[PDB]
C-alpha cells in the first residue's frame, strides 16, 4: 500500500549540493567584493536489535545528477526518528569526508500562507535588477542564469533545484554552500532565507550567518548597478 | 507645585590627577558641603538610594561602580531644599541611575567627553521640565528615550468596615466611565444607596471582601466613608426649615465634626446655626428597608461651601458638640 497524502506523513528533504571550497573560504574571510523520481523502501538499522523492524521510504528526485542539485525526500509513518537521524548523520559523515555537502533543506519554496507548505510568517523578499542600459523573456532568463553562475564563479555556485511539482511553474535556484533560495518571476527576482542548517550539519565550507548577510550586501550592490559592475559585465559579454 | 528642586549634579571619581569631577546645573555644589559629604559619595554598598541633610539642603543620591579594571565609579545626585517632602524623588533618581547604567553598557557615554558635555543639557532640560509639570519624555539616542513621572505618594488608607457608607466628595460625571475596573463599574451605580451591606447584594452580588477592597481603594483616592444613616433623632423637625433635612447631617458628618450617637440634641443645637447662616417624612418607614435587600435646588451644600469661603462657622463646627 502506498502513501495517500491525507495521512499526515512525517517528511523531510535532505539535499546534496556539489561544492568547491576555493571561493567558499575567501568571501568568508577578509577578501571582499528515465523518470524524475524514484522510490526505495529501506530498513533503517545498523545494530543487532531483534525487537523492531524499521523501514522508511526514500524518494530520489534525481536520476541524473549532472553537476546540478540533488535531493532526497524521506517519507515516514513509522519507527523512532532518532535512529533515522543517526542514519542521516552517518551518510553525512560519508558525504563530507571523501566527497561533498549533504544538507537538510527546507522544502518550503516561496509559498504564500494557506498553501500545504509554508508559514503565515514568510516575507518572500524582493531584489530588483536596475538595468539602465524577439523573445525578451527567454533570452533574459538565460542572461539571468549567467549572472547567477557568475556569482557562481567568483563566490557562490548555483543549482537549478528542479523540484517535483508537475508542469514546474517557477524556476528555483539553490545556492551552493549557504542559506539562500532564489526564484525568477517588476524586472528583478526574489530571495528567501533557509532556516534548516541551525549550527549542526555544519563544516568549514558553510556557516556563520554573517556570510549570508555579506552575500545580501554584495548581491544588492552588484544588482542595483554599483560602481560600474553591471556595465563592465555588459562589455565583457559583448566582447565575444 | 509642592516640592521644589533647585540643583542637579553628576560626579565622578577621576583618575588620580583629579579627585572627583562634577557636572553642575543650578544653590551651588560649594567647597565645604562637598568636603563634608565626600564620605557618602564613595561607599562599599552600591546601588542603594541614600539622602543626607545639611545646613543648606539635601543631596538625594545614588552611586554606581562599573568597568572594574581601572575601576570606574560615578554618581548622580539631586540636591533640593532642607525641609521639603522629597519622598517623591527617590525612584526618579534611582531610575536615572539605571538608565545611565544601560546607556554605558550599550554605547558608553562617559568614556568620550563630547557626550560628557552633551550630558549637561540633559540636566538643564530636566531642571526645567520637572518643575514645569512633573514628567519628562526625553530622547537621547536611537535606542533610549528616558521617561520620568512624579508620583504623589499619598499616605495609607484606613480600614473599610462592613457597615459604613461611602460618599463621593468629587463628582462621578468628571471621569471616563469606560476607564475603570469592572468591579468599580459594578459598584459605582448604587453608591449613593447608603449602606455597604445593602449595596453589595442590591447590585454587586460580589464577595464582601472584594467590595471591601474596592471601597478601600476608592478611599485611598477619592471617596470618604461615614457611619450609618438610620433616623436617630425625630424631634428636630419642629423648627421651620426650607427643605434642608437629609443632606445636612451627611455633610457635617463627612466633615468629621461629631460624637457619633446623635440622639436628639445635635441637630437642633446646630440647626439654629443653619437657620441663621442662610409631603410627610414617612419617618416610621425607613426601617424595613434597612436590612440586606435581595430653594429650587435644596440648599444643603451651597451654603456650607459659600461659608467655607469663610472660617468662623467651621471653627464653631470643628468644635463639634
Amino acid at each position: 500500500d502506498d502513501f495517500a497524502s491525507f495521512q499526515r506523513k512525517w517528511f523531510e528533504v535532505a539535499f546534496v549540493a556539489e561544492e568547491l571550497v576555493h571561493s567558499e573560504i575567501p568571501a568568508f574571510l577578509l577578501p571582499w567584493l528515465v523518470p524524475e523520481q524514484r522510490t526505495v523502501t529501506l530498513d533503517v538499522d545498523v545494530n543487532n536489535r531483534t525487537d523492531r523492524l524499521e523501514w522508511c521510504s526514500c524518494y530520489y528526485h534525481g536520476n541524473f545528477s549532472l553537476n546540478a542539485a540533488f535531493e532526497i525526500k524521506l517519507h515516514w509513518m513509522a519507527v523512532t526518528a532518532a535512529v533515522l537521524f543517526e542514519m542521516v548523520q552517518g551518510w553525512h559523515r560519508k558525504a563530507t569526508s571523501c566527497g561533498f555537502l549533504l544538507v537538510p533543506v527546507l522544502e518550503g519554496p516561496f509559498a504564500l500562507p494557506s498553501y500545504l507548505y509554508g508559514d503565515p510568517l514568510r516575507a518572500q523578499l524582493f531584489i530588483p535588477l536596475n538595468i539602465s542600459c524577439e523573445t525578451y523573456w527567454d533570452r533574459m532568463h538565460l542572461f539571468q542564469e549567467a549572472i547567477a553562475h557568475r556569482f557562481g564563479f567568483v563566490q557562490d555556485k548555483y543549482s537549478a533545484s528542479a523540484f517535483n511539482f508537475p508542469a514546474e511553474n517557477k524556476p528555483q535556484y539553490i545556492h551552493v554552500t549557504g542559506t539562500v533560495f532564489l526564484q525568477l518571476p517588476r524586472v528583478g527576482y526574489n530571495w528567501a532565507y533557509n532556516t534548516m542548517l541551525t549550527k549542526t550539519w555544519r563544516s568549514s565550507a558553510t556557516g556563520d550567518e554573517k556570510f549570508a548577510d555579506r552575500l545580501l550586501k554584495d548581491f544588492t550592490d552588484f544588482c542595483i548597478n554599483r560602481d560600474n559592475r553591471l556595465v563592465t559585465f555588459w562589455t565583457s559579454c559583448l566582447e565575444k | 507645585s509642592g516640592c521644589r528642586i533647585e540643583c542637579i549634579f553628576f560626579s565622578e571619581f577621576h583618575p588620580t590627577l583629579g579627585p572627583k569631577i562634577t557636572y553642575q546645573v543650578p544653590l551651588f555644589d560649594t567647597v565645604q558641603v562637598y568636603i563634608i559629604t565626600k564620605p557618602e559619595l564613595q561607599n562599599k554598598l552600591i546601588t542603594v538610594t541614600a539622602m543626607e541633610k545639611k545646613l543648606i539642603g539635601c543631596p538625594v543620591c545614588i552611586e554606581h561602580k562599573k568597568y572594574s579594571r581601572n575601576a570606574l565609579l560615578f554618581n548622580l545626585g539631586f540636591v533640593c531644599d532642607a525641609q521639603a517632602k522629597t519622598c517623591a524623588l527617590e525612584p526618579i533618581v534611582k531610575k536615572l541611575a539605571g538608565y545611565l547604567t544601560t546607556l554605558e553598557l550599550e554605547s558608553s557615554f562617559v568614556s568620550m567627553e563630547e557626550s560628557k558635555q552633551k550630558l549637561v543639557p540633559i540636566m538643564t532640560i530636566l531642571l526645567e521640565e520637572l518643575n514645569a509639570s512633573g514628567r519628562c519624555t526625553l530622547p537621547i539616542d536611537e535606542s533610549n528615550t528616558i521617561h520620568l513621572k512624579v508620583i504623589e505618594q499619598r499616605p495609607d488608607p484606613p480600614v473599610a468596615q462592613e457597615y459604613d457608607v461611602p460618599v463621593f466628595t468629587k463628582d462621578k460625571e468628571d471621569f471616563f466611565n469606560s476607564q475603570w475596573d469592572l468591579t468599580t463599574q459594578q459598584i459605582l451605580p448604587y453608591i449613593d444607596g447608603f449602606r455597604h451591606i445593602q449595596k453589595i447584594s442590591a447590585e454587586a452580588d460580589v464577595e464582601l471582601n472584594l467590595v471591601r477592597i474596592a471601597i478601600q481603594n476608592l478611599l485611598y483616592y477619592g471617596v470618604v466613608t461615614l457611619v450609618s444613616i438610620l433616623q436617630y433623632s425625630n424631634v428636630y423637625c419642629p423648627t421651620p426649615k426650607v427643605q434642608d433635612l437629609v443632606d445636612d447631617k451627611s455633610l457635617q458628618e463627612a466633615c468629621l465634626s461629631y460624637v457619633t450617637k446623635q440622639g436628639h440634641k445635635r441637630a437642633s443645637l446646630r440647626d439654629v446655626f443653619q437657620l441663621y447662616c442662610s409631603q410627610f417624612g414617612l419617618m416610621k418607614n425607613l426601617i424595613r428597608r434597612l436590612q440586606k435587600y435581595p430653594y429650587t435646588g435644596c440648599h444643603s451644600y451651597d451654603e456650607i461651601c459659600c461659608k467655607t469661603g469663610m472660617s468662623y462657622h467651621e471653627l464653631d463646627e470643628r468644635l463639634e458638640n
Binding site: - | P91, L148, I151
Partner: protein, 107 residues
C-alpha cells in the same frame, strides 16, 4: 525529537526499576535526565518505581513563540513609575533570558 510513542516505550521499559536524582536513562538511542522526583510532599534522593507512579516528560529543547501584544497602554505610566513596555521587556525578558542561561536550555 521524540514522538509520544517513544515516550510510551520508555514508560513501558521503566515499569519496575529504581531511580535517583540526575541519572541518564537510556533506551535505543533515546536519552533522558531524571529530575525532581516526589512522594506526595517531599523530594527524594533515590527510590523505586513500580507500575503505578506517574512519570511526566519535559524538554529543554522546545519550539517557542513569543507574541508581544502592543496597545496604547504601552506608552502609559503605572504605579512605581515605569512604562509597561519597559516593565515587560526590561524586567520580564531580562529575567527569562537569565533563567534560560541558568537552566542551560536551547530553544
Amino acid at each position: 525529537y521524540i514522538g509520544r510513542g517513544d515516550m510510551w516505550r520508555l514508560k513501558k521499559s521503566l515499569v519496575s526499576t529504581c531511580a535517583y536524582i540526575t541519572q541518564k536513562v537510556e533506551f535505543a538511542g533515546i536519552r533522558a535526565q531524571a529530575g525532581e522526583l516526589w512522594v506526595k510532599n517531599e523530594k527524594v534522593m533515590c527510590g523505586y518505581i513500580s507500575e503505578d507512579t506517574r512519570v511526566v516528560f519535559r524538554s529543554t529543547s522546545a519550539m517557542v513563540y513569543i507574541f508581544i501584544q502592543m496597545s496604547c497602554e504601552m506608552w502609559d505610566f503605572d504605579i512605581y513609575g515605569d512604562l509597561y513596555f519597559e516593565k515587560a521587556v526590561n524586567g520580564f525578558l531580562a529575567d527569562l533570558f537569565t533563567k534560560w542561561k541558568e537552566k542551560n536550555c536551547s530553544h
